[PDB]
Amino acid sequence: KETAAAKFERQHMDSSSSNYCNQMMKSRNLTKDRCKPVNTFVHESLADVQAVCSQKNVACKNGQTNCYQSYSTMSITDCRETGSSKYPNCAYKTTQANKHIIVACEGNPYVPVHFDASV
Ligand SMILES: [Cl-]
Ligand SMILES: [N]
Ligand SMILES: [N]
Ligand SMILES: [N]
Ligand SMILES: [Pt+2]
Ligand SMILES: [Pt+2]
Ligand SMILES: [Pt+2]
Ligand SMILES: [Pt+2]
Ligand SMILES: [Pt+2]
Numbered sequence: 001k002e003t004a005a006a007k008f009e010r011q012h013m014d015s016s017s018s019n020y021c022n023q024m025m026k027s028r029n030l031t032k033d034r035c036k037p038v039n040t041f042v043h044e045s046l047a048d049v050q051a052v053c054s055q056k057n058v059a060c061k062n063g064q065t066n067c068y069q070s071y072s073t074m075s076i077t078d079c080r081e082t083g084s085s086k087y088p089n090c091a092y093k094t095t096q097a098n099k100h101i102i103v104a105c106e107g108n109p110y111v112p113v114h115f116d117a118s119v
């Protein structure tokens with residue numbers, strides 16, 4: 001019964017080390033049945049990420065036009081499973097950057113529902 005907006009917050013928001021991704025991928029239920037291979041966390045306020053839905057309108061990867069690019073760079077952590085990672089012992093490399101995010105927005109209130117990319 002999780003909404004698309006709630007799922008985006010669970011997978012992609014960290015509004016709060018080398019082991020960050022190992023710990024975060026676990027606590028967000030992204031290693032439950034399989035190791036989710038790639039995931040990005042946004043290290044910004046929920047308000048600042050929701051505001052992206054009023055910024056630069058762009059096409060999404062899938063061809064819809066409800067995508068938005070952040071005008072500002074944001075603090076993000078990229079998590080990517082190692083070559084040698086095997087479930088249920090899921091292993092991630094943690095990479096920090098300052099990049100624009102692209103999100104899909106839907107619904108009322110009009111908030112992020114899908115992490116399209118970082119640029
Ligand atoms: Cl969707
Ligand atoms: N930027
Ligand atoms: N971060
Ligand atoms: N997403
Ligand atoms: Pt951070
Ligand atoms: Pt952080
Ligand atoms: Pt930029
Ligand atoms: Pt989606
Ligand atoms: Pt996602």
Ligand SMILES: [Pt+2]
Binds near residue numbers: 114115
């Ligand atoms: Pt997707």
